[PDB]
Design a protein around this nucleic acid. Structure first.
Ligand SMILES: [Zn+2]
Lengths: 99, 121, 55
RNA sequence: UUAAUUGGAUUCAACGCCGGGAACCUCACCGGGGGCGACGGCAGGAUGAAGGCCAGGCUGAAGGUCUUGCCGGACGCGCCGAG
RNA sequence: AUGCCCCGAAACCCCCGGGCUACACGCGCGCUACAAUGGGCGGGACAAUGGGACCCGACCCCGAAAGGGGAAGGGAAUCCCCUAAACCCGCCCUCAGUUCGGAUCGCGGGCUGCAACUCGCCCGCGUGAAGCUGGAAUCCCUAGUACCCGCGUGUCAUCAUCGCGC
């Protein structure tokens, strides 16, 4: 079996990669486990606006969201070559492991 | 009464070793001695040993305010830095176990004057 | 005149072991995710680093 | 008050604020010690220029300087500009 | 970042030591309290947000506590931080400066850190300072809000009576 974890800061790129993998699996005819959406990771940083100490304190909360999807497939020669031939856009990160 | 530390005489302390003295000392001093002396403290200890042997007649001065007094330096005058000058301290047998910087105060006693214009509302 | 002086001694902890890569400051360094960015720099930078103010 | 007790801010809109919970560092204050002038010129210089040291003195500790000599073989803050 | 002015071998650059932690006194914002709408002892329940590589560390052995030795797992919906407190039951105290209140010092044991005296935090025993509800005046709040109760994180080698959140 092969487990693939795909994470990105762009939901559209995430979905594009997921759809490409799904199409590859469908054309190869191999059963595929649907994309598991893992909980989004939200990095929040709260910072004081003023560069000095004078004035009423005000803060801004800058948030960076990272979205994660998981897929499980059964290993095959053509399927795995096609998957390794994925586009993997710049903002998406892909990890492949075998079980 | 004759001086005695934890029921031990000064001569017994002289003959004692560093580990036993650390055992007798409080927790902080024992931990410091177990962890060891800094290079500056080692240099100061070498100078003090030379003076005790009698080959170092010059006055002993140092910045080692963190040095822990030992029985082997009882009866000597050590000039300890405090920020401006090296205040002299005569090591009595009863100072054992205390830091060298506890007898060289850094601040000055304050005698407050009249309050200023902005002291009150 | 030797060069052994004029050199910062190695430091592994304290405020003297962290600096802003963009500003060189020594105070409010953000280490939340290894940013190593000063507070002012991060504030001026957040929109274009991928961070956003959603609400 | 002190050697310093480094500074900014004084109604709302100064005073757990400068994300300022400072042992060292931070540091901007105080006593002391040491150390840089890129680049052009003025003297001394390869029979000797930066720069380095084994022992010890000064020193809180330090070839930082000093007694003992020995490596270095081309430079030059001892001075004028500039940096 | 930067104009002008200034130091330019000093106001530049590094090393130790000290100070920013001083203390007749005035003020702001807070914590603990002045008790029964309670204190102590044993027992019984229920969260969330977030973080983890010289990092979080379950689990076993040692210790009375702080803490010490080995060490699974975890780059994280997989392991850990993490079996919260207020609350409920049973017993003692019965209106008292008290079994309230926990300042202030003695002795001893530890942790971090190159370094703990100036000037760190924790732990056992010992003592037990004002305070018995507060004038004039003055502050926040319209619903899961206000009030009470704890926890996460930012600062971090250690230190949270703090900010931002749960
Ligand atoms: Zn910066």
């Amino acid at each position: 079996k092969a487990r693939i974890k795909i994470a990105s800061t762009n939901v559209r790129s995430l979905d594009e990669v997921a759809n490409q993998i799904k199409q590859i699996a469908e054309r190869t005819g191999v059963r595929m486990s649907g994309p598991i959406p893992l909980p989004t990771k939200r990095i929040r940083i709260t910072t004081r606006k003023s560069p000095d100490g004078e004035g009423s304190a005000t803060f801004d909360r800058w948030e960076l969201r990272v979205h994660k999807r998981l897929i499980d497939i059964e290993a095959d020669e053509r399927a795995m070559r096609q998957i390794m031939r994925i586009r993997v856009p710049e903002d998406v990160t892909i990890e492949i492991e075998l079980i | 009464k004759e001086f005695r530390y934890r029921g031990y005489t000064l001569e017994q302390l002289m003959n004692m070793s560093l580990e036993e003295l650390a055992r007798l000392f409080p927790a902080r001093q024992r931990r410091s001695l177990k962890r060891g002396l800094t290079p500056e403290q080692k240099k100061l200890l070498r100078k003090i040993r030379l003076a005790k042997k009698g080959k170092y007649k010059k006055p002993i001065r140092t910045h080692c305010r963190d040095m822990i007094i030992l029985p082997e330096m009882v009866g000597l005058t050590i000039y300890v830095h405090n920020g401006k000058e090296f205040v002299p301290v005569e090591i009595k047998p009863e100072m054992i176990g205390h830091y060298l910087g506890e007898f060289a105060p850094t601040r000055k006693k304050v005698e407050h004057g009249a309050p200023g214009v902005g002291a009150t509302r | 005149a030797k060069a052994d002086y004029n050199k910062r001694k190695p430091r592994k902890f304290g405020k003297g072991a962290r600096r802003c890569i963009r500003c060189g400051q020594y105070g409010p360094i953000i280490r939340i995710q290894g940013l190593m960015l000063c507070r002012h720099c991060f504030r001026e930078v957040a929109p274009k680093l991928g961070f956003r103010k959603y609400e």
